[PDB]
Amino acid sequence: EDTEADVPVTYGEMVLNGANLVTALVMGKAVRSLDDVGRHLLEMQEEQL
Amino acid sequence: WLVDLTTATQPSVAVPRLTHADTRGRPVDGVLVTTAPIKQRLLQSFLKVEDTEADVPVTYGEMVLNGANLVTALVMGKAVRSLDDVGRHLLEMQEEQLDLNRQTLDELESAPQTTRVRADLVSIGEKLVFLEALEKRIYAATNVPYP
Amino acid sequence: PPGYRYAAAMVPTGSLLSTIEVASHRRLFDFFSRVRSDANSLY
Amino acid sequence: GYRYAAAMVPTGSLLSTIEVASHRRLFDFFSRVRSDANSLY
Amino acid sequence: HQPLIARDGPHPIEQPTHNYMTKIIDRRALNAAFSLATEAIALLTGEALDGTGIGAHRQLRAIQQLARNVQAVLGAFERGTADQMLHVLLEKAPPLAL
Amino acid sequence: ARHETGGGVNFTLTQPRGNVDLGVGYTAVVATATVRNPVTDMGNLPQNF
Amino acid sequence: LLPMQRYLDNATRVARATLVAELKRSFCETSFFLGKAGHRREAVEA
Amino acid sequence: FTSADIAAKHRCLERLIVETGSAVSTATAASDVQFKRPPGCRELVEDPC
């Protein structure tokens, strides 16, 4: 049906830069995105569901 | 052979509420229900889809014992469907006129409101058919044998 | 087997669409009456 | 040792649901919770 | 109300017949369970709470046991309708070979 | 309903329904189409007494 | 597989013991498909 | 051979056809060899015999 398909360019990055780095050293395990997994464990306590 | 499905039984009553129609608005007279593979075999070769999206109503029917019907459920123990209108029209038939063909009770009711529903449509013989396989919407990933 | 109520006929709810020989299949129904033309117990 | 609070905010979503107890030995920790268990908390 | 045609003798003269009916409704029912457990009540009740953030987090693990079990029951009736039509229409329908 | 066992608490919802079959004559057809697998092994099992 | 997608949609002893008669017959006939009945068209397109 | 049960059966074909469209079979498929039916289960099986 077609010859020329549209494809993405770059990969994804998952880096321990930021608040996850403290959990890499002192804790020694890691959430994927603690800046957003741990953040949204607060608005559900406060506001909505 | 599929014509012998659509002709072996004869149609029951005309409820003027349903109006399961097309985008064109033609009303459908029957509904087939098959499994998943027999639906695919009848769409590749044997039959041809007419229309993709059919108009279906949304509301249901309230049949409530409010009013003067409420007394006959308590003192007496049975209930007419619409005693406020069966009982109303038993004062004018004795008095005014005569007819062979009346006004049917359901034909004085409101028209429900309809939306647009994706469901495949099949024309066997000379009347429409809702054709639908039902092991993906219902019976998907439960412990239940498909009937 | 109750004798039903003849005035429910007198203003009907919803009309049929097809006439058939009815006494061929009876046990779909319960109180069935073949009325040869207008007869005694209709009144 | 499934950490319960991790998927209180999920990261992605599946599409197709199955009786998962058909194939079990692909996995390491898997539990049949009949609508609530005591050890869910 | 059956219709008529007139014939000639020696056919017998036929008269207008009438046909009259009663139907008795048949009745069926549905079923759906919901079960909680022992400790899921106390988190909704309040017997095992503190002033901490951990306990007030744990109610959100208990309220979302209900909401994942509410929609798995109130949705489980519309798929019983689509079940309890095909258990009747397999009883009123005799096969094409008969 | 509300009826408990084993520590747990069951809420067994019920809903009763009705079926009027408003068809003078036949209104539904089974059409037996295809044949999947036989359950019984067409074999020999002599019956005892 | 086609006799396993026709089993993961219902679990007792006989329903297992009919899969063995399925995994045999579906293998002894329709294993190598583009070599056996590759001359037709409807069998391939399905 | 059981002459009682056919005498309990009627003659009108307009239900004899439909009753053998969803008849109650004498066998169960989940049995080991082949069993008479337990009193709880009812498989809707059509019987041309």
TrEMBL record, chain C:
Record's protein name: Major capsid protein
Coverage span on the entire protein: 8 to 50 of 1374
From TrEMBL, chain E:
Protein name according to UniProt: Major capsid protein
Record organism: Human herpesvirus 1 (strain 17)
TrEMBL record, chain G:
Protein name: Major capsid protein
Organism from which the protein derives: Human herpesvirus 1 (strain 17)
Parent-protein start and end of this portion: 198 to 246 of 1374
